[PDB]
Amino acid sequence: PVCLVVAMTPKRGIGINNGLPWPHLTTDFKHFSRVTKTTPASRFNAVVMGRKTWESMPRKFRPLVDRLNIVVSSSLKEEDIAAEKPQAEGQQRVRVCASLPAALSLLEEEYKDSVDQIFVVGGAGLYEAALSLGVASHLYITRVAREFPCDVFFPAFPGDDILSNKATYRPIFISKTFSDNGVPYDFVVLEKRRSSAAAIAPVLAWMDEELIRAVPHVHFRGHEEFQYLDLIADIINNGRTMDDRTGVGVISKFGCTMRYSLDQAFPLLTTKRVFWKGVLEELLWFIRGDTNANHLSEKGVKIWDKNVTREFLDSRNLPHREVGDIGPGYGFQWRHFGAAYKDMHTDYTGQGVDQLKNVIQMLRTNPTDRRMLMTAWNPAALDEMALPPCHLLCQFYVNDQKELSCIMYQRSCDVGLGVPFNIASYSLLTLMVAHVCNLKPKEFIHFMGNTHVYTNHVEALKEQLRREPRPFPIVNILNKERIKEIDDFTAEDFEVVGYVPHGRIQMEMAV
């Protein structure tokens, strides 16, 4: 019973010019070091590698300490490796075998009592040979989210859908997303599947007296998206069937919380492609305090059209609104809170309270202040809006390390559709704000009120929950030097790096 341990691009690339295709991945190496060494007393592990893999290592690190180094090679001799560097005392001498079947036979003969776990470390020669013989019980895969130029590739295998879109291998473990040198990645493991408390118990047994899960197989679920998935599953399992303003039935839960890290990667959800062009163009729209939805619509972003139609504005009891007008909406309250609205064309400069500018000036001069809030809810002008704000409130926070976090409260949540859009939108705002203030982005926290999935979306969401997440992408702000204030961002100032989602899921917007 052997295990494979690899780092791998989406297109299964592993090496180039007999070296790693990426810049050094410190957290990947630490993870490698730990897996290959650790043991529950008397036994050391074994690291089986090829010649090209052995050679590609730095001289400093070979032989890999505390582990039986076995090199599969015909051309290299057992003494050339011995003459390469003097051996340090306390380690088994590096062993050379003809092929991989012969390599494991060596452990059967001479090391039957000493070795605990067996690890094949590279490369494509030994990996291919390992999967051929099928003696691999487990695969420890580091999924590099970014694509890199490669000439050596890891062989494709049943259930390699965990890398990109297309005896079996099922994921049992998915870690949260890590990053090094602007390279996002995460760790997965895959399985070859094909009376101190006796007194308490009966009190618990009677105490209960009273269906769907996200990716059942995956038992350790480090990935942060699991929040959102388990949140879908929960409302499908434990929510309440409700009616609606829209006329479409709803399953709703009240009081819901999600939080996502910003320090390593960006929570652009992977289980379905997120319309990022939308979250970007809409956020810049908000920041401008723009209330004209045509400016969005023309850019290819049609998210607001149905709620600013001639038909909808009349039902929303505003016959004197122009098509495209969202009223004094999200962005208007941010940049001009309380100001007298006229139309989308009127210039509202200097009028009202610019919450966004004050939130920054507070962050930049006095970050411990507890009044760093931006609201979109104005009970005075709710009726003048074409549709009341969902994401209505957000608070900011700085710690010791000059790291920035952001809470956002949402009154009403279309989990299937709006939520992943909302996560990504505000997390982006945190990145923007953090940069302008000279702070590290840390964490984004999502507070939810009415949290609901629409009944017509339910079939599509079970489809989404069969999908195990991919590593998060990195969002980079570009022209970091050129942008100094929050209004200096443009659409081209951003870069989504290594975003490899699952295929598009179609979901109708509830009018």
How far apart (Å, rounded) are the C-alpha atoms in residues 373 and 377?
Answer: 12
- Which listed residue (32, 228, 421, 489) binds ligand CB3 by CB under 6 A? 421
Strand pairing partners for 70? 48, 95
| Chosen from ligand CB3, ligand NDP, ligand UMP, none, partner binding at 251 (C-beta under 5 to 8 Å by type) | none
Q: Which of residues 80-119 bind ligand NDP (CB under 6 A)?
A: 99-100
* Per-residue contact flags (x/-) with ligand UMP for residues 236 to 255, judged by CB under 6 A: ---------x----------
To the nearest 10 degrees (0 to 180), the angle between helices 226-238 and 418-437 is 150
Cis-peptide, bond into residue 63, ω within 30° of zero: yes
Q: Which phi and psi (to 5°) does residue 36 adopt?
A: -70, -15
**Is residue 48 at the binding interface for ligand BOD, with CB under 6 A as the rule?**
no
- Which listed residue (117, 175, 333, 422) binds ligand UMP by CB under 6 A? 422
Q: Is the separation of the CB atoms in 297 and 316 below 8 Å? A: no
**Is residue 5 at the binding interface for ligand BOD, with CB under 6 A as the rule?**
yes
- Which listed residue (146, 391, 467, 470) binds ligand UMP by CB under 6 A? 391
Residue 358 neighbours by CB under 8 Å, 6+ apart: none
Q: Report in angstroms how near the CB of residue 140 gets to ligand UMP at its nearest.
A: 38
**Is residue 186 at the binding interface for ligand BOD, with CB under 6 A as the rule?**
no
- Which listed residue (65, 98, 167, 382) binds a second copy by CB under 8 A? 382
Task: Return contacts of 483-488, CB within 8 angstroms, 24+ apart.
Answer: 483/435, 483/436, 484/436, 485/360, 485/436, 486/287, 486/356, 486/357, 486/360, 486/432, 486/433, 486/436, 487/287, 487/288
125 is in an annotated binding site: yes
Q: Which of residues 44-103 bind a second copy (CB under 8 A)?
A: none
CB atoms within 10 A of CB 505: 17
Residue closer to a second copy (CB basis): 272 or 335: 335
Q: Is the separation of the CB atoms in 110 and 85 below 8 Å? A: no
Residue type at position 180: D
| Chosen from ligand NDP, ligand UMP, ligand BOD, none, partner binding at 152 (C-beta under 5 to 8 Å by type) | ligand NDP
- The region of 49-57, 127-135, 170-178, 464-472 touching a second copy under the rule CB under 8 A is 170-178
Which one of 390, 394, 406, 437 is the catalytic residue? 390
How far apart (Å, rounded) are the C-alpha atoms in residues 386 and 89?
Answer: 77
Active site residue 390: yes
CA angle 388, 393, 398 (to 5 degrees): 165
Q: Is the separation of the CB atoms in 336 and 352 below 8 Å? A: yes
Q: Report in angstroms how near the CB of residue 478 gets to ligand CB3 at its nearest.
A: 23
Q: Which of 343, 327, 303 is nearest to 376 (CA)?
A: 327
- In the complex, the residues that contact ligand BOD under the rule CB under 6 A are 5-7, 20, 24, 28, 32, 57-58, 61, 121-122, 142
- In the complex, the residues that contact ligand NDP under the rule CB under 6 A are 6-7, 14-15, 18-20, 49-53, 56, 72-76, 99-100, 121-126, 129, 152
Q: Residue positions in the annotated binding site for NADP(+)?
A: 7, 13-19, 51-53, 72-75, 122-129
Q: Residue positions in the annotated binding site for dUMP?
A: 245, 391, 410-414, 422, 452-454
Residues belonging to the active site: 390
